[PDB]
Amino acid sequence: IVLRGPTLAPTLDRTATHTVTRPRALGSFHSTAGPAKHAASIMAECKDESR
Amino acid sequence: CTTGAGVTSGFIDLATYDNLDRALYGGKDATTYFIKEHYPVGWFTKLPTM
């Protein structure tokens, strides 16, 4: 009778189970900030020519 | 690739955060959208009458 290496099929594991899909990592590179500021304009209360 | 804008390209907008955005948005007590608070109302019914 014919003799040969028996064929064994691996089993177990898990394929396409409980898809998560969360690989994103937040963060990027762009400009830092802007150094801008302003004062409260200029007030003027003067009349009568007090020298 | 031009087809990668499915979920990306919004991270740059989120990261574009400054002092004006601090003053306007954010905060421990700041409310958020996508959330609605439900409160009970009275129980009643209506119908037309002669």
Automatic annotation (TrEMBL), chain A:
Superkingdom, natural source: Viruses
Name used for this protein in its record: Uncharacterized protein
Source organism (scientific name): Singapore grouper iridovirus
Full-protein positions shown: 411 to 461 of 461
TrEMBL record, chain B:
Subcellular location: Virion
Protein family: Belongs to the NCLDV major capsid protein family.
Protein name: Major capsid protein
UniProt source species: Singapore grouper iridovirus
Full-protein interval shown: 3 to 52 of 463
